[PDB]
Each structure stands twice: as C-alpha cells, then as structure tokens.
Structure 1
Amino acid sequence: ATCDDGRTTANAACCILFPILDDIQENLFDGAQCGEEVHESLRLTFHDAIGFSPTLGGGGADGSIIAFDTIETNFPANAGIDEIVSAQKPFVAKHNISAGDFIQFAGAVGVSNCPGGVRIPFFLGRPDAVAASPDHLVPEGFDSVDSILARMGDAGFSPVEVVWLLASHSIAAADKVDPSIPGTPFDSTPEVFDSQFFIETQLKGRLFPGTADNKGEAQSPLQGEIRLQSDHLLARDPQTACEWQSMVNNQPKIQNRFAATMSKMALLGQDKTKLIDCSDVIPTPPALVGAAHLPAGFSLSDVEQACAATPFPAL
C-alpha cells in the first residue's frame, strides 16, 4: 500500500503509524537518538507486558501500566517508571492508537535507533486494557535466580529466553539501584546494542561505583558501570551460565533471539492472528562497527568462567 504522504507499507491499516513514528522520533526520542528515553521505553515494554499470570490475571502487553498508572506505579518494582509513563501518556491521548500498541511501537522504534539493534516485529490493534496488573509480578534486581526463572516461566519464558531478553541490559542504566549515581549503565556501551553486557557481567566484581550497601547491587568490574545482583547471579548460575556465555561475541544470535523473544513478550495477553502486521514501519537500525572485546587492560584471568562444557572465548 502507499500512504497519503507516499511512504509505503505492506498492510494499508499501518499508514496511521507514520505520523506517530515521526512524532515520537522528534518528541519522545529527542531526534531519533539511542539515549535515556529509548532505554526507559524499552524497560516500559517489559514492565507492561510481564503483568500477566495465568492464576492471578493481568492482560500482559495491554497498556495497563499507563491506563492504570495510579495503581501500577505504586508497585515498588516500578520505581522510576512514572517518568516515562508521564512522557508517553500525551502521545496516546493525541494519536489514535491504544496505549498497549503505543508502548510496544515506541519500544521497537527506540531499539531501531541503536547501532547493532533489530526491528522487533510489531502488530497493530491491541484493545484498551480492562484490568490493572496484579501486584508483585515484576522481577527485581534482588530476587534469586530461582525466583526470577519461576516468574518468567509462569509468563511463558524458558530460562534461555530470559537470557535472550536480557540483551536489553546492553542499552540500559540504573537510577534507583544507587540513587547517588543515577544514569550509571550496565555495560560500557549503553548507546550500542552489542554483547558487551554479557562479557562485562562475567568479570570478577571489583568495587562499588557509588555507595556500598545498596539492595540488589553487586560489585561492578569498572568504576563507570553498575552491576545488578540478579545479572551477577544469572551469569554464574548453572541453569543459565552456558546460555549467558553463548551470547558473548555472538551478535547474530543476540539479534535473532532478541527480536523473536521481544515479539513474544509484546504479544503476551494478545492473539497475533487478530492483529495486523506492521513490522515494516519500524526504521532500519545502524549496524555495529567495532569488535566485541574485554575492557582494555583486562584478560581472561579476570573472567569468572561459569560454563563447564565450554571455555569462555579468547577475545
């Protein structure tokens, strides 16, 4: 189909996304940058979608974190999410799409701004949310591995799919884990969707980049990086360690698995056969240029190898 401004997309119902694309690239992502607003929007896709439990309810990727913000931003695991919920709300009021479509659309557009990134498949048509998520369904940085895997398993994700979704922490920082150092990132390249996150979490912890006593924080290997206790444990746990290592220096697998498992997350609570595919509206991401690496001056003896089947690669 050809839309009114002459841009084309495979399914004509998708034409309505083009003005919304332009508005968010200008006014939400500050001129299509891979910056804080993109990271916050990507985190919002997960905090919206994961509100889904067969036994308790929640409609998953349904926009409930905006439509019922009053309730869901009270949950302690949503700390800090209110800023990006407030920022997105006027876009939803002004355009003609549901909050659940908007959150996943903004997350996929945001990701496409980051070098190395992918186009997450995007479907249009989710109805407005009809219930707030239940409480206590969002994993925290201080939860054990078994707790996190049980929660993600309960929403439909295997342990390998959790590892794949955690490539999101390649373009990510924390504001609330240690409030004295907000904006400190989880890897050395928070503007680049690459395997540095899986590398650098495998390094021996050395110091705390701000204060020492913060709940859900492990020691970081670098003054300018922060480490969640969850990522520290998942990189080392026999249930996830070999998968975590396998992402290192494996950008094709990161890209393939992150797109497919993000599309699955974006569809929790929904049925794709009732929606329309508008994947082709998402911009084309830049590619990587630089090779994966240990941080300069580090070597294999600084890596805590945790996969008995396969040694950590020589980078």
Structure 2
Amino acid sequence: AKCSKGRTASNDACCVWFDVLDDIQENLFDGGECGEEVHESLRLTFHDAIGFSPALTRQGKFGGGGADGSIMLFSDIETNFAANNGVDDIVEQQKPIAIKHQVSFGDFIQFAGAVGSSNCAGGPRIQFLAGRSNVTKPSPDHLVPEPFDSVTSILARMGDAGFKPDEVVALLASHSVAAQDTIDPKLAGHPFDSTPSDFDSQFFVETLLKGTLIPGDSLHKGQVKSPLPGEFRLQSDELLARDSRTSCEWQSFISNPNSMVPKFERAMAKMATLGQNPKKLIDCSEVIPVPRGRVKQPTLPAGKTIKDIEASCRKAPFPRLPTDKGTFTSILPVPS
C-alpha cells in the first residue's frame, strides 16, 4: 500500500498512522523530543493497559478492558482515581488529537508511547498494533499499582494482568525516562534517574545506591530517600531493586544493558494488548521510527563507590562498573 509523503505500508489500514505520527512528533513531542509529554505519554500506556483483572473476571465480575482507551473515554471517572493523579493533563491533550484522525483512543495511547519512546536516546522500538475498539466501560478502581504497595502485592497485581516478576522489572525500565509531579509537588519534574531522556540502565544503578538525602522538606507516602540531589526515589522501586524475587533481574539490566530494550519491547507488546486479541489487530509497527543512540555503559555517579551499592542478588555478584569523574552535578528537573 501507498501512504502520504511517499511512504509505504504493507497494510493499507496503517496509512493513517503516518499522519498521526507527523502530528504528535510536532504538536505534542516538540520535533520528536524525549521530554515531559513523552514521559507522561509512556506512563499513560500503563494506566490504560493495567485496568485488567482476569481474577475479577473469573468471579462473574467486570475486570476492566485493558488497553481499551477507557481512561480517555471515561476520563472524568478514571482520572479521579487516586492512583491516577496528574494523569488528566496528558489525557486532555491527547483527546482532541485522536479525534481529528478518528483513531480509537486505545490505539492512540499505545501509539504515542511507542512513538515518544523512540525519541529517547537508545530508546526502544515498541510493536504497534491497531484496531482496538472505541467502545468499552470504565476501569474498576484500585487496579493500578501504587508506589507504596508492597512488592508482594505489586507482583500479584501484575501477575493477575499477565506478567511474571522478570517482566515487571523489564517494564519498569520506563523509569529511565521518568519524573514525578504528585508525590511531592514542590519537587515536581525531578527524575527517577540522572538521565531522564536517555533510555539507559542508569535507573537500575541509582536505585541500588543507598538513600542518603531528603530532597524536599520532608518525605512522602510512596517516597523514600534519594541517593543524589535533583533525583526522586519511589518506595516501590527501592524495594523491587532489593527484593529477592526481583533483585537479580534488576541487576541483569546493569550487567547486560543490551538486554534492556528487547526485554522491554517484548513486555510492552504484551501490555499494549491487554484485553486485546493480537490476531484481531493489524501490524502497523512500520510507522514507529527506528530509535537513534548506542547502548551507554552504566556508571556509578560522582561521589559514589561500590560501597554505596546495596547488592541484593544472591546468584550473581554486582558488576565492576566505573565511577564518573569530577564532583556530582545536581540533576536538573525535566522542563515544564
């Protein structure tokens, strides 16, 4: 098939996404930058997808429709979940966009995440299937994992959805390109790692550092201590990095940074299609750009040493990674 601007799709129905791609890379991702709107976007893929409980379904109860765009269709309901605070912003930006192209909301949300992550340095190229219904029902509450939930409860929430523990760690790779706004509003935009626009293993490293700093005037529900100024640290992430169910895979992304993108692509492709039949969708992965950027060597921050690493696995010693030189430069917030 032939699409706009001299472009080609194996399947004709994918042709609309090429023009969607042009719009969001300009009028949402600012010339395809890996910034706030990509971060929000990528986070939005999860808040839509995870509204999916087969355990609830098995009991004659509605268990959510996963990647069905309901968070957008029923924004009023869903975004006033406490687990969904700060989410209404990127929903209300995306909504008019997906309307003009008459793509379904579920399709659109998975698209923006797939597109934006490709904008990130050493970013992943996420599979993108299309044709999700635009008819669904709002997600039941309390399905989204909270940063103050226990690992045990978090594993069980994602296992219910479909994920084994290894896969959760993989998905969390998204935190490399991430900051918070609602745990501590006064620290809004401070990233979970030192390089929030690179898709690198720095998140897995800095999560294993000891928490030594209180960045705000106090700590908060779901927040623990940071290892570095400018950096925020989630309770859930600190735990998962050290939990013996998850510590070794957490570490695997450090000892083998090449494995991070393909492992994260696999799991994302599951997530983008929770509550969906892939055999009932068409493959428009072509539209999603090839990411630029080499896999970076993971480094220990300036001022840090292997002594600062809370090594939590068990089968395999921590890898000998070099320390950055100089004094540590306090980490700049993600732009407004």
- TM-score normalized with structure 2 length: 0.92
1:163 to 160, 169, 181: 169
Question: Which residue type is aligned with residue 52 of structure 1?
Answer: F
Q: Distance in 2 between matches of 1:274 and 1:267?
A: 11
Q: Is the 8 A contact 1:63 1:100 kept in 2?
A: yes
Aligned residue runs from structure 1 range 253-268, under 5 A: 253-268=259-274
Match of 1:41 in 2: 41
2:244 to 235, 238, 245: 238
The CA deviation string for residues 151-199 of structure 1, in whole angstroms up to 9 with x for no partner, is 1111010111100000000000001111111000000000100000000
Match of 1:31 in 2: 31
Match of 1:123 in 2: 129
Q: Secondary structure at the match of 1:242?
A: helix
Question: Percent identity at matched positions?
Answer: 64
Q: Secondary structure at the match of 2:8?
A: coil
Match of 2:99 in 1: 93
Match of 1:82 in 2: 88
Question: Which residue type is aligned with residue 116 of structure 1?
Answer: G
RMSD of the alignment, in Å? 1.0
The CA deviation string for residues 34-91 of structure 1, in whole angstroms up to 9 with x for no partner, is 0000000000000000000111411000000000001001100000001000110101
The CA deviation string for residues 213-258 of structure 1, in whole angstroms up to 9 with x for no partner, is 3111011100110100000000011111111111114222101110
User: Alpha carbons of 1:116 and 1:4: their partners in 2 closer, same or farther (altered >3 Å)?
Assistant: closer
Match of 2:330 in 1: none
Give the stretch that moved more between structures: 87-96 or 193-202.
87-96
- The question of 1:3 aligning with 2:33 is answered no
Q: Is the 8 A contact 2:200 2:296 kept in 1?
A: no
What's the offset of the Cα at 1:2? Answer: 2.3
How many residue pairs match? The answer is 315
1:311 to 298, 309, 317: 317
- The question of 1:111 aligning with 2:99 is answered no
The CA deviation string for residues 100-126 of structure 1, in whole angstroms up to 9 with x for no partner, is 000000110000000111110000111
After TM superposition, the runs of 4+ consecutive aligned structure 1 residues lying more than 6 A away are: none
Q: Secondary structure at the match of 2:186?
A: coil
Q: Distance in 2 between matches of 1:220 and 1:169?
A: 15
Q: Is the 8 A contact 1:41 1:84 kept in 2?
A: yes
User: Alpha carbons of 1:129 and 1:248: their partners in 2 closer, same or farther (altered >3 Å)?
Assistant: farther
Question: Which residue type is aligned with residue 31 of structure 2?
Answer: G
Match of 2:325 in 1: none
Note the residue ranges of structure 2 that are not aligned, 5 or more in a row: 57-61, 322-336
Match of 1:146 in 2: 152
Q: Secondary structure at the match of 2:205?
A: helix
Match of 1:229 in 2: 235
